[PDB]
């Protein structure tokens, strides 16, 4: 196998053009195909397409309207262009080798991928945007342990990251802040939750402090029970 080095701008806005490049070290294009593959944060792998050193290309049927690949024999580089991106194109983009060979006339071997680059993380969204913060009032879902869960929903922000404290940093025990999910919007949401004793509800105060530094948004939200 070979060593693939890849680069290109990974921060895009809707309708722009992704342009990534991969460089071959430790071999040459030879008779092989050279490919682009992506991994969106939810989904599994998507094969994007391939190219050989003579310029023959084969593309994924659902992406070919927007995708074209190029090769630069002189530099030992091949490229991906994908126009009119949306948040549906957000993903880690890998280049790789597809070293297919014929064995006689009807027989292909090494139908695999093998020289996988390290990946380029591409995100697609319009602008910096601060979160909307809502309370997650205590639900009491461990009867045996007499414990409740309460929290804050940190919704629809871009880009990462967001930091959540509780009670201006005095409350860390029992806190768990989840990784963000990426929504179809291209915006992120996350939640932070505290496991507390049920008897504390309504006497102890719980306030979550959300700071999304990318947008200089700080929000404090009190989280109180719904009903006694």
């Amino acid at each position: 196998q070979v060593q693939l080095q890849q680069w290109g701008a990974g921060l895009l806005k809707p309708s722009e053009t992704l342009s990534l490049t991969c460089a071959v070290n430790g071999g040459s294009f030879s008779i092989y195909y050279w490919s682009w593959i992506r991994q969106p944060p939810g989904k599994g792998l998507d094969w994007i397409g391939e190219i050989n050193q003579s310029g023959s290309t084969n593309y994924n049927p659902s992406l070919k309207s927007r995708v074209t690949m190029s090769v630069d024999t002189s530099k030992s580089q091949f490229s991906l262009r994908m126009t009119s991106v949306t948040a549906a194109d957000t993903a880690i983009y890998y280049c790789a080798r597809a070293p297919r060979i014929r064995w006689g006339s009807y027989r292909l071997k090494q139908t695999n991928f093998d020289s996988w680059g390290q990946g380029t993380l591409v995100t697609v969204f319009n602008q910096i945007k601060g979160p909307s913060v809502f309370p997650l009032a205590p639900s009491s879902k461990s009867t045996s342990g007499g414990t409740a869960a309460l929290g804050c929903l940190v919704k629809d922000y871009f880009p990462e990251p967001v930091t959540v404290s509780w009670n201006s940093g005095a409350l860390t025990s029992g806190v768990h802040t989840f990784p963000a999910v990426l929504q179809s919007s291209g915006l992120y949401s996350l939640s932070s939750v505290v496991t507390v004793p049920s008897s504390s509800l309504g006497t102890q105060t719980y306030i979550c402090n959300v700071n999304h530094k990318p947008s200089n948004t700080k929000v404090d939200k009190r989280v109180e029970p719904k009903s006694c």
Partner: protein, 214 residues
């Protein structure tokens, strides 16, 4: 072409043997010998384990073995070791001169005893609803191994649109937590008797339900 179907999650204890299936069609797995298998550790690049259904590159442990019967290829991992905990993907060349991938399988090597998740489902807050939005929040905690699937239900009908779910990660105790979100309009929230979060873990499902009338 259509993604190869894999199981979402497979687990085993160290020393165990496990198999991961990968189901396609006539045009990929079935009529050809074009199946590959890759191991993906978080943040590392994919690694080839098996190609042409059953050939192993030199440098891949012989604990890894591939095979095919009908439209289903299978990757067997013998003598499970903790380093084998990763995501696994199959792939195939096709008779239409394309490649397709599998949907991916999370392999867990049980280093600790199994722990069932605790599920806590939050309805939309009044504040979110006044803002003409609604999000249901399903919090999943205190479980091991760190693999789950989450299904949402409106009444008894499956909800697929507007679902996002995180990959499990460790809490400060040493068990896992995950989270799933259902985005709805206030109208859809009010328009049903209940919504449920269904959390499937190691062969068992825990369900929680909220209602716009509570």
């Amino acid at each position: 072409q259509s993604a190869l179907t894999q199981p979402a999650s497979v687990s085993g204890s160290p020393g165990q043997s496990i198999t991961i299936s990968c189901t396609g069609t006539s045009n990929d797995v079935g009529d050809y010998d074009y199946v590959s298998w890759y191991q993906l550790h978080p943040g590392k690049a994919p690694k080839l384990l098996i190609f042409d259904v059953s050939r192993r590159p030199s440098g891949v442990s012989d604990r890894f073995s591939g095979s095919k019967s009908g439209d289903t290829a299978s990757l067997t991992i013998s003598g499970l070791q903790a380093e084998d905990e990763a995501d696994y993907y199959c792939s195939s060349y096709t008779g239409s001169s394309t490649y397709v991938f599998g949907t991916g399988t999370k392999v867990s090597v049980l280093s600790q005893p199994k722990a069932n998740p605790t599920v806590t489902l939050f309805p939309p807050s009044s504040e979110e609803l006044q803002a003409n939005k609604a999000t249901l929040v399903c919090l999943i905690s205190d479980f091991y191994p760190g693999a789950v699937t989450v299904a949402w239900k409106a009444d008894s009908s499956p909800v697929k649109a507007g679902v996002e779910t995180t990959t499990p990660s460790k809490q400060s105790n040493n068990k896992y937590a995950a989270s799933s979100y259902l985005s709805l309009t206030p109208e859809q929230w009010k328009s049903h008797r209940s919504y449920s979060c269904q959390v499937t873990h190691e062969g068992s499902t825990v369900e929680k339900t909220v209602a716009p009338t509570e």
